[PDB]
Design a protein around this nucleic acid. Sequence first.
RNA 1: UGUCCUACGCCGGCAGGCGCGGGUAACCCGUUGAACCCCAUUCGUGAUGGGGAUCGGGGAUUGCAAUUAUUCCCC
RNA 2: AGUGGAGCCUGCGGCUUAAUUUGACUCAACACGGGAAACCUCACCCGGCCCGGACACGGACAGGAUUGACAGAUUGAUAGC
Lengths: 249, 120, 30, 73
Amino acid sequence: PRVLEVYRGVREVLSKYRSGKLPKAFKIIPALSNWEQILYVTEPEAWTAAAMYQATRIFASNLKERMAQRFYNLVLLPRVRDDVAEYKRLNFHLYMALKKALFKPGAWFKGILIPLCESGTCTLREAIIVGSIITKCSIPVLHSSAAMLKIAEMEYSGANSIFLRLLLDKKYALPYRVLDALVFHFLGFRTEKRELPVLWHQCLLTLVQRYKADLATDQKEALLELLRLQPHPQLSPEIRRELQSAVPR
Amino acid sequence: FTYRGVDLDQLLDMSYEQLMQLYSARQRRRLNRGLRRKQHSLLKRLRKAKKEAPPMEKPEVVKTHLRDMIILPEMVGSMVGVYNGKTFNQVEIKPEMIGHYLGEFSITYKPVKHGRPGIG
Amino acid sequence: KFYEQYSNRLQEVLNDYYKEKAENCVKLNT
Amino acid sequence: AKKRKKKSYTTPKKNKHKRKKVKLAVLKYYKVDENGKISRLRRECPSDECGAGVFMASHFDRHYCGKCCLTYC
RNA sequence: UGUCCUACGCCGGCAGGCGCGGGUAACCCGUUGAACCCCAUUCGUGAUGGGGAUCGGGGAUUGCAAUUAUUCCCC
RNA sequence: AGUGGAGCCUGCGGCUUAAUUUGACUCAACACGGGAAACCUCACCCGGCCCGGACACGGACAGGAUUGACAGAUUGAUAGC
Ligand SMILES: [Zn+2]
């Protein structure tokens, strides 16, 4: 009816949005019930990066974490993956969109990071960009630990070690189940005949720099065995040195 | 002073749609299309600067970037500075020049004085 | 919570949008 | 290779605008008599979701809701 | 070539407006009703009625905006 | 048949400009960048808001850190930046 043509009009507005105030019908989108229909009327695939930054701003600011999760999984993350794949870098507006999406961390981890990791096709540039984005944002310890348990339990991809390492650089107090999952993942790399890159070695090195004081002696010797079986000419002496000069408790 | 045989007083007191017969085709087309919000905001600014002036003193200068303004008879007496891309040019609004645009009163380029030619 | 997870105002805003779209070109007031 | 000099140049950007700090904003919401009866100075929001907790910004003529933007006269 | 290409009628000096139909196309534009060329009129060897630039006024469309002439029409 | 002589238009040098954005200089430099640019298409100029990393240290924050915002007043911009 009359609502449909107004939302076609604001669809035409959002396809060319650069700056300024948006219509007030756009800002009351989360307060409505049938949001998916009017959102598909607004055609988010044809949005401008500034318009999607404002949409992420609005949707993150208005509570209801499940709906923010659905918006991040359905609209924001495909746009990010399409922009990295074609432009080989992330836009300024979309970068601040992902930061304002990390304003809501619970919908972010379960909507942006974990679906990207379980998609399997996550490239290295996407890993670097998203890891820098989680590096900039201060993250709650519970959400970071749950995401680290998630990424530890998953099947390995080369992009996963960057996320794991940049989560270990946060230097938070770690739950001991999380460290058990990390050690079990690395000891799951014990019998792999695949050549592992320097990224995996750097993730292990980071785990030994920051959490060597909270490692049991049995898993310490297991990590020494791990270094023995899967060596590197450069990093493995340093990981061995850091494991040798560690005090527990 | 008179404009198409019409003097300034009955230019001011005349309503809007009889001015849609006394301009050129361009100005009639523009004012029939309707003026933008920025035109109307500058119009309020100019009338505010005109009302808030001493009777013997000229009004305060209103500076604007607008170059597509059509001078209506309401702005005769306004003290207006127009941007030409680099610098403001301040002008009195005279009544013999109502049928013109503001932007032609601030020229956006310099007259060319040719120097001695180089190697070519 | 992570692994186990998986109108009068409307018409008033419509009227405000229509008024805002009408106020872009006023063409009437002197 | 050939390095650079790193011209410094001083530009003072210490002055930045921030909003004013309001201290103890809860005290003006309620007025309590000496017996212990609570009087609510500010209007309660009769909205769909934010009821019984959200007050009104008291304008010079009207009231405003701070979560769903409800306007009165 | 065409979903902007236009058929028809009316208002129009003319650019153009109005009401209506066809054509997502060997169908409707469109038997594409082209221009040179041909036949009659005036001009009659001069900056000429050749040549049209440059200017002065009006009018109408395109487009948020034509002032530094967008374009077209008429003296 | 012309071009080169004339008026106009376009290209390259040069001259102006705050800017008159730009690769190529006897074929393959010369209506090539589908480039017939009034906003974008612009690479140029004159102004004006905004913020620009992690880590370490020192503050504030639960006696709210910070986020979101209707109406009105401002500057050249409907700037709750
Ligand atoms: Zn509200």
